[PDB]
């Protein structure tokens, strides 16, 4: 081979996702965190195991990036740390919310090509690349991840802005809800030590009821729904409705005070903002993608309630890939070995030429 490998990076809210073009899955996945004492910086799970010693920050906590010093250290972490690479080597594929303001994108550009002296690189909104994991270039894609959820319709691999709905409604605000639930039922689960646990219970033991009523009938009147989880000092505790109950609330978010559209109303919403020529193509073609998304029971609940609100003749297909826990990166992975896609780099060349505008351009 003459090219060397590029680099894949998606940036999340709560985690980032780094590998090589080609592979199959990410190589490393870390906290989206940078900390500093109460060695200077930490980034990733050790600012997050020395957090007893240290004040964290979050530059990219809801998806956009808030703090560029800090981030350009998570992107060092990234490539220094975690990969062993030398960016100036490596051509790089980053990964961008949706609606992530056009200075934004300018700013990661220069600091790539100045900052990293990349040699390459190129910046794709992350539902486009789920999409294009799932074989489609058509179709609307709920993401649910840590920090926010987006329902983004695409057609022909644009991603239609118009349409585009931000829900601040994810992960963390469930694995919160979690906590006060177990606590209501008479654990006590307030710490961050705490919350670490109940992310657990959470990722491992709920799930999304097809019907919350039957559901909250069921576990009222047996046991039949519960499930045992130790805790590392060896008690065994007992989770029940509150399996289904938390990530009820993205169905119905004002279990948690939110007046805020649930995921399907949402996902709905963004559809009926799109021509209409392109409704059956988006209804047919309805994609999960993030950790949020992983919950056992989503995909047909999201048929039957999506079901429920558009019209009686139209196919409704709600895709939900074993692997869309990553399906970012997995997209921009792809995306990235494509024959096609070499001549849509921004080479160093075209920044010289023509500054960090040219993203606009090129990464249409
Ligand atoms: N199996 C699972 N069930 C439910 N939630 C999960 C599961 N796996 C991960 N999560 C949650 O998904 C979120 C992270 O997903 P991710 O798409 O990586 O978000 P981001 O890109 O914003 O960091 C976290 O809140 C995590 O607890």
Same mark, same amino acid.
């Given at each position: 081979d003459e090219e060397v490998a590029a680099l894949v990076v998606d940036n999340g809210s709560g985690m980032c996702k780094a590998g090589f073009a =080609? +592979? +199959? %899955? &990410?190589?490393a996945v870390f906290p989206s965190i940078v900390g500093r004492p109460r060695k200077d910086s930490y980034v990733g799970d050790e600012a997050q195991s020395k957090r007893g010693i240290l004040t964290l920050? #979050? &530059?990219? !906590?809801? =998806?956009?990036?808030?703090?560029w010093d800090d981030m350009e250290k998570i992107w060092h972490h990234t490539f220094y *740390? !975690?990969?062993?690479? %030398?960016?100036?080597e490596h051509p790089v594929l980053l990964t961008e919310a949706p609606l992530n303001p056009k200075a934004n994108r300018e700013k990661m550009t220069q600091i790539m090509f !100045?900052?990293? *002296?990349?040699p390459a690189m190129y910046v794709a909104i992350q539902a486009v690349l789920s999409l294009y994991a799932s074989g489609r270039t058509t179709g609307i894609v709920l993401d649910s991840g840590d920090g926010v959820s987006h329902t983004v319709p695409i057609y022909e691999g644009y991603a239609l802005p118009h349409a585009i709905l931000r829900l601040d409604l994810a992960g963390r605000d469930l694995t919160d809800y979690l906590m006060k639930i177990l606590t209501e039922r008479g654990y006590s689960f307030t710490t961050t030590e705490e919350r670490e646990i109940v992310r657990d219970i959470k990722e491992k033991l709920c799930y999304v009821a097809l019907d919350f009523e039957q559901e909250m009938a069921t576990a009222a009147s047996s046991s039949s729904l519960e499930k045992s989880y130790e805790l590392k000092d060896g008690q065994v505790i007992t989770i029940g409705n509150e399996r289904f109950r938390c990530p009820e609330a993205l169905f119905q978010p004002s279990f948690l005070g939110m007046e805020a559209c649930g995921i399907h109303e949402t996902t709905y919403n963004s559809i009926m903002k799109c021509d209409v020529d392109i409704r059956k193509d988006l209804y047919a073609n309805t994609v999960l993608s993030g950790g949020?998304?992983? #919950? &056992? =029971?989503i995909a047909d609940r999201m048929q039957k309630e999506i079901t429920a609100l558009a019209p009686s003749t139209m196919k409704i297909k709600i895709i939900a890939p074993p !692997?869309?826990?990553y399906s970012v990166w997995i997209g921009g992975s792809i995306l990235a070995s494509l024959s096609t896609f070499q001549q849509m780099w921004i080479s160093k060349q075209e920044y010289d030429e023509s500054? &960090?505008?040219?993203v606009h351009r090129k990464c249409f």
């Open positions: =080609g +592979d +199959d %899955a &990410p190589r920050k #979050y &530059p990219i !906590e809801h =998806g956009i990036v808030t703090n *740390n !975690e990969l062993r690479v %030398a960016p100036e !100045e900052t990293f *002296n990349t949020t998304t992983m #919950y &056992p =029971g !692997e869309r826990k500054g &960090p505008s040219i």
